[PDB]
Scaffold this motif. Structure first.
Motif, PDB file in Angstrom:
ATOM      1  N   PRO A 169       0.784  -1.239   0.000  1.00 59.51           N
ATOM      2  CA  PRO A 169       0.000   0.000   0.000  1.00 59.51           C
ATOM      3  C   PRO A 169       0.819   1.293   0.000  1.00 59.51           C
ATOM      4  CG  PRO A 169      -0.046  -1.018   2.182  1.00 59.51           C
ATOM      5  CD  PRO A 169       0.581  -2.020   1.237  1.00 59.51           C
ATOM      6  N   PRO A 256      -4.177  -2.799  -3.704  1.00 59.12           N
ATOM      7  CA  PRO A 256      -4.044  -2.521  -2.274  1.00 59.12           C
ATOM      8  C   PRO A 256      -5.344  -2.550  -1.481  1.00 59.12           C
ATOM      9  CG  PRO A 256      -2.851  -0.898  -3.611  1.00 59.12           C
ATOM     10  CD  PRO A 256      -3.780  -1.639  -4.526  1.00 59.12           C
ATOM     11  N   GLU A 257      -6.487  -2.770  -2.133  1.00 56.66           N
ATOM     12  CA  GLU A 257      -7.703  -3.099  -1.378  1.00 56.66           C
ATOM     13  C   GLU A 257      -7.453  -4.272  -0.433  1.00 56.66           C
ATOM     14  OE1 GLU A 257     -10.555  -2.336  -5.359  1.00 56.66           O
ATOM     15  OE2 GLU A 257     -10.377  -4.314  -4.397  1.00 56.66           O
ATOM     16  N   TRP A 260      -4.179  -2.952   3.339  1.00 51.69           N
ATOM     17  CA  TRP A 260      -4.280  -1.515   3.544  1.00 51.69           C
ATOM     18  C   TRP A 260      -4.000  -1.146   4.989  1.00 51.69           C
ATOM     19  CZ3 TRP A 260      -3.610   1.801  -0.052  1.00 51.69           C
ATOM     20  CH2 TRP A 260      -3.873   3.166   0.197  1.00 51.69           C
ATOM     21  N   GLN A 262      -5.344   1.968   7.151  1.00 51.35           N
ATOM     22  CA  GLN A 262      -6.160   3.174   7.132  1.00 51.35           C
ATOM     23  C   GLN A 262      -5.590   4.270   8.027  1.00 51.35           C
ATOM     24  OE1 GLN A 262     -10.273   2.719   8.236  1.00 51.35           O
ATOM     25  NE2 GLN A 262     -10.897   4.590   7.160  1.00 51.35           N
ATOM     26  N   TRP A 267      -8.291   6.727   3.260  1.00 54.13           N
ATOM     27  CA  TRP A 267      -9.173   5.976   2.355  1.00 54.13           C
ATOM     28  C   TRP A 267      -9.287   6.739   1.038  1.00 54.13           C
ATOM     29  CZ3 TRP A 267     -14.268   3.196   4.306  1.00 54.13           C
ATOM     30  CH2 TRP A 267     -14.774   2.407   3.255  1.00 54.13           C
ATOM     31  N   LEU A 271      -9.659   3.412  -3.909  1.00 58.14           N
ATOM     32  CA  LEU A 271     -10.054   2.201  -3.186  1.00 58.14           C
ATOM     33  C   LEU A 271     -11.539   2.214  -2.874  1.00 58.14           C
ATOM     34  CD1 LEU A 271      -7.188   1.810  -0.658  1.00 58.14           C
ATOM     35  CD2 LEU A 271      -7.224   1.036  -3.000  1.00 58.14           C
ATOM     36  N   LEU A 274     -12.049  -1.479   1.399  1.00 58.35           N
ATOM     37  CA  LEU A 274     -10.859  -1.774   2.198  1.00 58.35           C
ATOM     38  C   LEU A 274     -11.140  -3.159   2.759  1.00 58.35           C
ATOM     39  CD1 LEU A 274     -10.186   1.510   4.196  1.00 58.35           C
ATOM     40  CD2 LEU A 274      -9.439   0.873   1.909  1.00 58.35           C
ATOM     41  N   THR A 277      -6.901  -5.210   6.489  1.00 67.31           N
ATOM     42  CA  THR A 277      -6.239  -4.002   6.963  1.00 67.31           C
ATOM     43  C   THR A 277      -5.408  -4.214   8.218  1.00 67.31           C
ATOM     44  OG1 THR A 277      -8.172  -3.318   8.255  1.00 67.31           O
ATOM     45  CG2 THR A 277      -8.045  -2.519   5.975  1.00 67.31           C
TER      46      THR A 277
END
Length: 280
Positions: A169, A256-257, A260, A262, A267, A271, A274, A277
Motif C-alpha cells: 500500500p 491494495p484493497e 491496507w 487506514q 481511504w 479504493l 478496504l 487491513t
C-alpha cells in the motif's frame, strides 16, 4: 475436468465500456490486477465451487502476536472465502494461547507448534520444508498472511490463481527507483534500479500449493545463501519475495484493497473497498 456452468442472468459485459478507467487492471504479462468492479463474484464462485476448491490460510503468531488471533480469525470467518472449504493453519509457539473461535461449516483450524536468523527464515522454511506433503494432501490453494490484521470486506476466490502477490500500500503509486528492494549486489534478493514491476507486500501472497511451495523453497534457499555470505536483505523475506516475483511473474496481482493501513494512509477514492487491513 470442469463441468458446465449453469444458466446465469447478469449484466452483459460491454467491450467498449471498461469496468475501471482510473487504474491498471491487467499487467504487461496479461495477469489481471484485482480491483473492485473488475469481477463478477457470482461467476467466480460458481467456477470454484464446481471444483470443490479448498483454500488453506497460513498465519504465524509468535510471542505477543498471539493476541491478534481472535480478531484475525473472527473477521476471516465473516469475510474470507465464505461458502468455500477453508483450512486455517496457525503456526505458534503457544498452542494454548490460540483462542477458540467458532467456525462456519466446511471450515477447520489446525494449530501447528513451532520451536534471529532462523526466525527470519522460519516462515519460508516451514511452508516449503516441513508442511510440504500435508498441504498437497489437504488444500488446493495456499494463502500466506500476517496475523496483525483484520478482514473488513470480502476476500474471496477472485484472488485464486497459480501464483499471486499483492501491491504494497505504500508503493503502488511509486516509481521503481523508490521501491525498497534489496539494492546490494551481494544479496540474492538484489534488484537493480532499472528493474522491477511492482513492490509486493510480504503480508499477503499465495497461489496453488505447488507454486507456493516453489516460491517458499526458492526464497528459503536464497536466504540461506545470504546468511552464509553474511548479509541479511533489507526487508527480510519480503525482499526475497520481490526478487522471486520479478523473475517468476505472478498470474494475478491483488490491488491494495487487499492490504491496507487506514491509520497511515486514509481511504483514497481509488479504493472502493478496504478488505484486509492493519490493526492499529
Amino acid at each position: 475436468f470442469m463441468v458446465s456452468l449453469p444458466r446465469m442472468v447478469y449484466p452483459q459485459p460491454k467491450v467498449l465500456t471498461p469496468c475501471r478507467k482510473d487504474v491498471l487492471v491487467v499487467t504487461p504479462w496479461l495477469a489481471p490486477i484485482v480491483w473492485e468492479g473488475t469481477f463478477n463474484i457470482d461467476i467466480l464462485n460458481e467456477q470454484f465451487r464446481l471444483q470443490n476448491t479448498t483454500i488453506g490460510l497460513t498465519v504465524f503468531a509468535i510471542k505477543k502476536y498471539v493476541a491478534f488471533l481472535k480478531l484475525f480469525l473472527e473477521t476471516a470467518e465473516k469475510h474470507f472465502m465464505v461458502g468455500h472449504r477453508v483450512h486455517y493453519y496457525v503456526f505458534t509457539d503457544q498452542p494454548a494461547a490460540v483462542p477458540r473461535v467458532t467456525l462456519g461449516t466446511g471450515r477447520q483450524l489446525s494449530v501447528l507448534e513451532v520451536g534471529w536468523q532462523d526466525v527470519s527464515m522460519r516462515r519460508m522454511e516451514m511452508i516449503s520444508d516441513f508442511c510440504e506433503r500435508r498441504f498437497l494432501s489437504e488444500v488446493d490453494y495456499l494463502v500466506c498472511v500476517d496475523v496483525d490484521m483484520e478482514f473488513r470486506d470480502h476476500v474471496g476466490v477472485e484472488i485464486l490463481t497459480p501464483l499471486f502477490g499483492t501491491l504494497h500500500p505504500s508503493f503502488y503509486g511509486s516509481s521503481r527507483e523508490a521501491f525498497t528492494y534489496e539494492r546490494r549486489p551481494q544479496s540474492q534478493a538484489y534488484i537493480p534500479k532499472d528493474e522491477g514491476d511492482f513492490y509486493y507486500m510480504g503480508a499477503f501472497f499465495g497461489g496453488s500449493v505447488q507454486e507456493v511451495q516453489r516460491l517458499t523453497r526458492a526464497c528459503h534457499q536464497a536466504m540461506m545463501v545470504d546468511q552464509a555470505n553474511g548479509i541479511e536483505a533489507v526487508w527480510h523475506d519480503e525482499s526475497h519475495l520481490n526478487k522471486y516475483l520479478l523473475r517468476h511473474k505472478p498470474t494475478k496481482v491483488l490491488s491494495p484493497e487487499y492490504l491496507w493501513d487506514q491509520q497511515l494512509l486514509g481511504w483514497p477514492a481509488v479504493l472502493r473497498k478496504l478488505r484486509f487491513t492493519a490493526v492499529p
